[PDB]
Design a protein around this ligand. Structure first.
Ligand code: 8LT
Lengths: 99, 99
């Protein structure tokens, strides 16, 4: 699909069998979701947002469906204001910017 | 153009007689640039997200040239870690997400 930017580019994602709303974010290198339960082990990561840095939990090889497109990749979990789909997964679903 | 998301989508912008590098950010409501003076009146604003909030100066009806395309809108100036072109100007140059 083609998504315009007059409103926030919010889409439905599915992860762990549950639907969530998330922001398609070309400014985000990585994908970060609000506190939730994911399987396996995690590693520490620091990410820098508009306001400064925060600690998040990095989970690898996680199954996540984004607007119907299946991806498997790295998902970070931490105190984000909104669920964010970053470039690591936008590339998996074939997303580009066009004008 | 069609801009890949393999790397950060950085472009050259022209604003207030200066050439700068900026990030095309679909996750940003606003356009935020590093400290600089702009013409006209300004008012303080707080913007935030991951890391917390930062105080910026809001200038309205500012002309920017983004990758060849002229656009007019609100520009925020303050201690952003990177120059960001947000949705308020991305719409004006006809920028969309496509997959
Ligand atoms: C490494 O992986 C991640 C890094 C940061 C984030 C959180 N994000 C992504 C948004 O593109 C960004 C960009 C911040 C910029 C310095 C790289 C952002 C910019 C402007 C605005 S604004 C105030 O203009 O709307 C909001 C915004 O993100 C919020 C939605 C969440 O913080 C941010 O803070 C994620 C992953």
């Amino acid at each position: 699909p083609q998504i315009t930017l007059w409103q926030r580019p919010l889409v439905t994602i599915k992860i762990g069998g549950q639907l969530k709303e998330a922001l398609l974010d070309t400014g985000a290198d990585d994908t970060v979701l609000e506190e939730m339960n994911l399987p396996g082990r995690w590693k520490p990561k620091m990410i820098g947002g508009i306001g400064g840095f925060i600690k998040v939990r990095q989970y690898d090889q996680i199954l996540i469906e984004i607007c119907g497109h299946k991806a498997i990749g790295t998902v970070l979990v931490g105190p984000t204001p909104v669920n964010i789909i970053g470039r690591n997964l936008l590339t998996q679903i074939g997303c580009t910017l066009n004008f």
